[PDB]
């Protein structure tokens, strides 16, 4: 319209995304352990350590090129007997959004005064990064939670009722099924 308009309000969040690589299978403690990757570029970067759902220990990280990367795992600053560990990266592991999956009720239905939840699964997509934007009649508080199964839970609490749109983007590409429209019901506020 020629008179102008505000359109719709928005809120946003970003999360780092990686596959889980199990290493040095034993009763190792997580507090005195550290881990890094050396890429084929020759520029060392740190890894995220994890105790995975089956009880085994592993790493996760984002590669910056294709080809052989070396993981180096350390106890008290000294390298472990398994190191270095080679991992070979293909171009399909760098940021293929077509491989990303999602689930949960917050992609379809919601409420005002109770938060709506949904899960993102990048384990089957390799490595990259998830950027997320919720749009609608008002601003929303977005929160996140990493799960022991290797997936990410996302939550939000919308102030006004109506229809909200959720955008799911991985490595600068919008993922399958997105944009998600979400019907939010509510009242004028109650105890």
d(CA 161, CA 140): 11
Q: What share of the chain is helix, strand, coil (3-state, %, to 5)?
A: 5, 50, 45
Is-contact 130 120, C-beta < 8 A? yes
Residue with tokens 């995975």: 52
Distance CA 50, CA 179 (A): 31
* Backbone torsions φ then ψ of 125, nearest 5 degrees: -100, -5
Peptide bond between residue 57 and the one before it cis (omega within 30 degrees of 0): no
Q: Does domain 19-96 have CATH number 3.40.50.720?
A: no
Distance between CA 147 and CA 168 in Å, rounded? 18
Write the CA distances from 119 to 82, 148, 176, integer angstroms: 34, 13, 14
Q: What is the spatial distance between Cα 156 and Cα 104, in angstroms, rounded to a whole number?
A: 13
CB 87 within 8 Å of CB 21: yes
Domain ranges of the chain: 1-18+97-191, 19-96
Which CATH number applies to 1-18+97-191? Answer: 2.60.40.10
* Strand partners for 78: 75
Do the domains spanning 1-18+97-191 and 19-96 agree at the CATH topology level? yes
CA gap 59, 19 in Å, rounded: 9
Interatomic CA distance for residues 86 and 84, integer angstroms? 7
């Amino acid at each position: 319209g020629a008179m102008g308009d505000d359109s719709m309000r928005m809120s946003h969040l970003k999360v780092g995304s990686a596959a889980d690589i199990p290493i040095n299978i034993s009763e190792t403690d997580l507090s005195l352990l550290t881990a890094t990757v050396v890429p084929p570029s020759g520029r060392e970067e740190p890894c995220l350590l994890k105790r995975l759902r089956n009880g085994h220990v592993g790493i996760s990280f984002v590669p910056k090129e294709t080809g052989e990367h070396l993981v180096h795992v350390k106890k008290n600053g000294q390298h472990v007997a398994s190191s270095p560990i080679p991992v070979v990266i293909s171009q399909s592991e760098i940021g293929d959004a077509s491989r990303v999956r999602v689930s949960g009720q917050g992609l379809h239905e919601g409420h005002t005064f109770e938060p709506a939840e949904f899960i993102i699964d990048t384990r089957d997509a390799g490595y990259g990064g998830l950027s997320l934007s919720i749009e609608g009649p008002s601003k929303v508080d977005i929160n996140t939670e990493d799960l022991e199964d290797g997936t990410c839970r996302v939550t939000y609490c919308p102030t006004e009722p109506g229809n909200y749109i959720i955008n799911i983007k991985f490595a600068d590409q919008h993922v399958p099924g997105s944009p998600f429209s979400v019907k939010v019901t509510g009242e004028g506020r109650v105890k």
